[PDB]
Design a protein around this ligand. Sequence first.
Ligand SMILES: O=C(O)c1cccc2cc(CNC(=O)c3cnn4cccnc34)oc12
Ligand SMILES: O=C(O)c1cccc2cc(CNC(=O)c3cnn4cccnc34)oc12
Lengths: 169, 169
Amino acid sequence: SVAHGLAWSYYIGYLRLILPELQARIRTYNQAVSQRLYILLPLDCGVPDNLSMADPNIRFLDKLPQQTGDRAGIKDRVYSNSIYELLENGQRAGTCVLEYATPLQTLFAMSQYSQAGFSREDRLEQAKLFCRTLEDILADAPESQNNCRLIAYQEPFSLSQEVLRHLRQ
Amino acid sequence: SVAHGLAWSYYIGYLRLILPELQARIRTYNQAVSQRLYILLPLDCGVPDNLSMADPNIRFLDKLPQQTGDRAGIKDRVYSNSIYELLENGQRAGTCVLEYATPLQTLFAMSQYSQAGFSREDRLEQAKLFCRTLEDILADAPESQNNCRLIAYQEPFSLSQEVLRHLRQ
Ligand SMILES: O=C(O)c1cccc2cc(CNC(=O)c3cnn4cccnc34)oc12
Ligand SMILES: O=C(O)c1cccc2cc(CNC(=O)c3cnn4cccnc34)oc12
């Protein structure tokens, strides 16, 4: 399936490369930010560029120092991550590296382009299969050593509360 | 198929975003470099990080000024491209933005991991289907306006000569 290929490329072309170096980048920034990469997986494939627009209680703090690596003819290809503070009744309840799983934008876009041959009704099913495949990959991956957490959800809602339930172990 | 999803995500998550801004970045660097993004598509899915290791006549010149954009919770996500000089009998015969199509690394890796459920024999077929799907996408895409060229090839070989045949219109 397309969700199967998306989960494998997201692991091979991104997670496999940043998850080994992540704790070192977090330690560097901490000179406190939590140790895992928190990945938001909205099953509706709704991926806004601004997290604060999804929930005002999710607030951008700072960028994590960039990771660079020569890859496939690209000198110093850059991998960037953002740090967010999570508010709960006016209080900073958590601080973590947080982002949406970008392949869900591909599912959203493919469901909209007629040439992609993917119906708008198939988004939910493909997102669920992307989630399951990625969980199966990370469960058995050596690069994932208590440093990655997938947060999958369907709105019937507090996004910051869903993140916080995961942050609080 | 997985090649279908890879071609659509490579377009949606990368090409769709950089191809509109590419001529402006090339004009900026030129204050001469050719106007198209040249994408190497080895059908054997062999993707080395160093182009000069694939052919000594392909020589790294400089980085093209980075492109940044806020995306899916990432503040200032970076898109980087490299400029190469192409030598032919000691002479600089061309200068272009050149890189390998990264999803071919996913096909290579999936053919090696038992959990991916993709045989090592299926690489060639999947790379060909990735190529055809991407050509079909770019043929009809509004972002592609004489600014992208796919260079697909099978070794029986000069890589620099294959690039140069495309560079010379
Ligand atoms: O990297 C993958 O293995 C991969 C596999 C499938 C689909 C996609 C979509 C992307 C996004 N690309 C970038 O962010 C990017 C930034 N500089 N840059 C230079 C060359 C190529 N890509 C990029 O990567 C993919
Ligand atoms: O971007 C896509 O739409 C896409 C779709 C499918 C597979 C892949 C693999 C990649 C490579 N990722 C990066 O280069 C990258 C760099 N910073 N960063 C921050 C968050 C996420 N990804 C990245 O992007 C994909």
